[PDB]
Amino acid sequence: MIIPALNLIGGTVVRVQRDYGNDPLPRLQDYAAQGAGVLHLVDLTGAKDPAKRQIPLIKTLVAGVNVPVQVGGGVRTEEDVAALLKAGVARVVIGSTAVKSPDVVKGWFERFGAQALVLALDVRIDEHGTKQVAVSGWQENSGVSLEQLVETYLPVGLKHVLCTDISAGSNVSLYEEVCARYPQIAFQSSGGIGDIDDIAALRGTGVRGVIVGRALLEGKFTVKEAIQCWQN
Ligand SMILES: NC(=O)c1ncn([C@@H]2O[C@H](COP(=O)(O)O)[C@@H](O)[C@H]2O)c1/N=C/N[C@@H]1O[C@H](COP(=O)(O)O)[C@@H](O)[C@H]1O
Numbered sequence: 071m072i073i074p075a076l077n078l079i080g081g082t083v084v085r086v087q088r089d090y091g092n093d094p095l096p097r098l099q100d101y102a103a104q105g106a107g108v109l110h111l112v113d114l115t116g117a118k119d120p121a122k123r124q125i126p127l128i129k130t131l132v133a134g135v136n137v138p139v140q141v142g143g144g145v146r147t148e149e150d151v152a153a154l155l156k157a158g159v160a161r162v163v164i165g166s167t168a169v170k171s172p173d174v175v176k177g178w179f180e181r182f183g184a185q186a187l188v189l190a191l192d193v194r195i196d197e198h199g200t201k202q203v204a205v206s207g208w209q210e211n212s213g214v215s216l217e218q219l220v221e222t223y224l225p226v227g228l229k230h231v232l233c234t235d236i237s238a239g240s241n242v243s244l245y246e247e248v249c250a251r252y253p254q255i256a257f258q259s260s261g262g263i264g265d266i267d268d269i270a271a272l273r274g275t276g277v278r279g280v281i282v283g284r285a286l287l288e289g290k291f292t293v294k295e296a297i298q299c300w301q302n
Pocket of ligand 1: 114191
């Protein structure tokens with residue numbers, strides 16, 4: 071599936087910065103109108119300040135579409151997850167916290183269920199060829215590999231994993247490897263999509279979701295054409 075994405079800062083759509091206007095709902099509705107089944111939102115305001123979590127806006131955007139929306143952005147506490155889900159969010163995307171407190175997040179899986187949580191992994195292939203997990207782009211590796219963290223959450227029923235290469239299209243070999251090793255996990259690719267050929271390159275990798283952000287905002291292609299290429 072194609073997963074259109076938007077980055078939000080105080081109700082503003084931004085390139086990750088560059089402004090794209092403060093009217094995200096018509097964009098999302100048109101995305102869904104072209105056949106999109108899932109949408110993706112990153113709350114950068116809430117990621118910076120937890121008390122600034124754009125819950126009312128998210129609640130409006132969710133109510134404005136007919137498709138499940140997965141939302142992430144500095145999700146730190148069990149209360150953050152509950153608040154987002156209560157706002158109508160389908161799945162909560164968790165990156166940093168899932169790396170720093172695995173035992174706590176594993177408790178979240180037990181309470182909320184694996185259908186409501188998405189494990190986001192920022193991955194850098196280091197000097198040794200290890201798929202290192204990082205909490206952000208401006209910080210060093212954490213000393214934990216993708217395999218270690220994935221197999222840590224498998225006992226609590228891990229299903230959805232968002233994998234971003236932060237070390238030009240998407241890293242095809244990367245996704246081919248991880249999707250084959252963990253066939254019981256629906257992997258989502260993220261970052262790298264520059265044109266329509268980048269989507270075609272991921273068709274046989276085994277990924278179940280392709281997240282596209284910029285390419286849509288810059289008119290490289292439409293969601294419709296993306297889905298057409300994806301379904302071949
Ligand atoms: N400062 C940030 O930019 C940031 N901070 C966190 N995230 C993501 O949020 C999620 C949760 O992060 P935490 O706040 O829990 O650590 C993870 O997936 C992170 O990668 C961030 N990523 C934002 N942009 C995303 O990166 C990808 C780029 O795609 P492209 O346009 O097609 O090229 C898309 O998925 C975009 O939505």
